[PDB]
Ligand binder design. Structure first.
Ligand SMILES: [Fe+3]
Ligand SMILES: [Fe+3]
Ligand SMILES: [Mg+2]
Ligand SMILES: [Mg+2]
Lengths: 423, 423
């Protein structure tokens, strides 16, 4: 079994490092003064970057892989997506959900993602997708720690037996309580739904992840209730507000007042760049707003924010290969986090910040932690992002669970020349 | 030498096709009723997509590869970019320009780009970068047909001897006359600069490519003069308006009136998604506009529009690997061209539409044309875009000038499994 990871670069650290492994855990981390020779039981990072696993804090594995079945969304609109999904009703079965979820999960494993939080629609009396996902969670456990959010897609108070179904999902094992206040019939139902969500989270000792203010409505401010209730219960770490795209449209004065509460509350924020740029701003003509939450300001204020892919190859987001560096690339551009350091530190948005969002207790390259880490064939975060590098090796429990042999490009000039896109 | 390309898929066509080659040209194109066997002198597209070469209609090879030299742009702003570039003055020499231009050109060759239009700053009495680029043009000719735009970066009327230098650049061989009306001191200088630009283009029989209205100013309407002068001279095909980001902020009534002229004029438009999303909207707080020109509406109106990378690894755009599918990916998202067909037809924005913009006379998979084509290991444009596939083979004059052996990804579950990110 692997005993050491050598010649590793670490974000924010100078030089090369050696990571000693023992019994599936990291036993020690020592600096090197030069390049170490490879040997049996040693995985050579070859001066590449070693980081804890990529994390997917927000994805919908119950709808993934269905784009084009039976028809494609030609307009690319949310409205048509709903219609196209409805046309696939007959195919939505236990086995179908498991098959599609597993397909995307395999892409995630290949992409060095070892932690995934999937929302699952529980506005379904049969709870078909949930029962399927609970089995998938057990099956994929050796490679990915999957969290399931009981997501009341049609509302808690605005859907028949919505609250009862949400609680049933928790009784069946869902890890996180979801909500969607801006989709409830009224602002009052929205606020009330959050009180019910928090009550359930405290009753069952579960995390919370709200689809919060995902709308270009400057009056959608459910985020303040999410943060206030978290602060009141002293449970910020266990709470997440997903999307908050409405924040992109708030006036600056309210946002400034709100930020004090956001920081004090300690709650987490998830932005989903690929989907947000696609679905937001659809009611604008020109100019058209970007519609992503205030990521840059959150980072400047020390508020934990991270990036999710949200949808993969489905009616609402037709693209994706479940690649976090791709999600990061889009987020850095749309959020204008384009300074060298901002780009280089970008990896935090798809690693450490996301681990905090999932309230992970065993994450990071540190002595005592499980030997879960990935190797990127790049010098630093900037380089990894610029070249959209694959994951050379993914290690879990001290064992390699995925590897990618990089593409080899050659140009035939007066003589053949290898091209690696580095200067 | 290669005599045939077999098992090729073609955009907009059903089935597989065989492309016969002779004397460096395409002699015939025949449909296949099934898969053909490989053989000596046959390049197997393996049911991948075959298209004419990718095109880079707008890049600055004189500034490429300088990011971080001597210091990095930490804010990521245009302002700091100017300062960082100024700090590298001592390194700007003939050989330096040639070295950096060639580095990016090699990345472009590796990425199946056989046609490139580079702007070169001619607001320099020594015309250092231009003299260097003219040599590069000759040197890279076997692999890339390079067009040079004499770009008066500091203005024609607003810079000492600006007009004389612009004309000198044409007398030295620049292929295209550039301008930048919104950067001139006054609106009047802006309009006058365009009359001078058109007069020079007609005097020397050159193309025109104006950095046009690249500013979030709803009053920057130099595009109407570019189109009107083109229509008056009956030279629309030879004219291009780059950027036109101001159009993102125009009221709809003026835009509707303007579009009639744009269509009648026949001029070309270049949008630069990666840079536009980064540099535009910088004076907005929240909400923040996207700042890309009206690509979707242009396509719906039959106005030729295409995508350029603009900057690669420089003070103003720190990222990039000169990859057109990456540029396309950003453009489809920001312009909300996310319907299945819109994404699939996206390849036109980086192939045929760009060829028209460069006024290319030998481009396309058609009998009689030079055997210049590339092979993508994908089923169609949608698939190529979604998976960000590399160029498997680039063929020029019937000879392979670049090839990429795809990355190989494996996940180790109960058994090893190859992952290709296809469902
Ligand atoms: Fe979601
Ligand atoms: Fe430019
Ligand atoms: Mg959603
Ligand atoms: Mg520019």
């Amino acid at each position: 079994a692997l005993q050491t990871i050598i010649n590793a670069r670490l974000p924010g650290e100078e030089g090369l490092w050696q990571i000693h492994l023992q019994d599936g855990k990291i036993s020690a981390i020592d600096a090197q003064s030069g390049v170490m020779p490879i040997t049996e039981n040693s995985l050579d990072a070859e001066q590449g970057l070693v980081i804890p696993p990529f994390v997917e804090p927000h994805i919908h594995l119950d709808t993934t892989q269905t784009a084009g079945q039976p028809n494609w969304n030609q307009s690319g609109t949310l409205f048509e997506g709903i219609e196209r999904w409805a046309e696939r009703k007959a195919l939505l079965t236990h086995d179908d959900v498991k098959q599609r979820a597993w397909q995307t999960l395999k892409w995630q494993i290949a992409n060095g993602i070892q932690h995934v939080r999937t929302h699952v629609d529980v506005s379904d009396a049969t709870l078909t997708a949930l029962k399927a996902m609970l089995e998938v969670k057990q099956e994929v456990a050796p490679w990915i720690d999957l969290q399931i959010v009981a997501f009341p897609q049609e509302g808690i108070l605005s859907y028949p037996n919505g609250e009862a179904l949400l609680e049933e999902a928790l009784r069946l094992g869902a890890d996180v309580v979801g909500a969607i206040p801006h989709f409830e019939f009224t602002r009052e139902y929205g606020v009330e739904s959050l009180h019910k969500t928090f009550a359930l989270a405290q009753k069952y000792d579960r995390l919370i992840d709200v689809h919060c203010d995902e709308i270009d409505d400057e009056q959608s401010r459910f985020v303040e209730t999410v943060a206030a209730l978290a602060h009141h219960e002293g449970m910020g770490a266990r709470v997440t507000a997903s999307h908050t795209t409405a924040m992109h449209s708030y006036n600056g004065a309210y946002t400034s007042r709100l930020f004090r509460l956001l920081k004090m509350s300690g709650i987490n924020f998830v932005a989903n760049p690929l989907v947000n740029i696609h679905l937001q701003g659809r009611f604008d003509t020109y100019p058209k707003r970007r519609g992503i939450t205030r990521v840059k300001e959150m980072l400047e204020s020390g508020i934990n924010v991270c990036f999710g892919h949200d949808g993969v190859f489905d009616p609402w987001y037709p693209l994706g290969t479940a690649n976090m560096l791709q999600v990061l690339h889009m987020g850095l551009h749309v959020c204008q986090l384009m300074g060298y350091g901002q780009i280089n530190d970008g990896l935090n948005l798809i690693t450490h910040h996301s681990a905090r969002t999932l309230n992970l207790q065993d994450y990071g390259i540190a002595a005592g932690n499980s030997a879960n880490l990935i190797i990127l064939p790049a010098e630093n975060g900037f380089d990894a992002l610029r070249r959209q590098v694959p994951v050379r090796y993914s290690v879990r429990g001290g064992k390699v669970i995925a590897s990618t042999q990089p593409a080899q490009t050659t140009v035939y000039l007066e003589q053949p020349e290898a091209i690696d896109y580095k200067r």
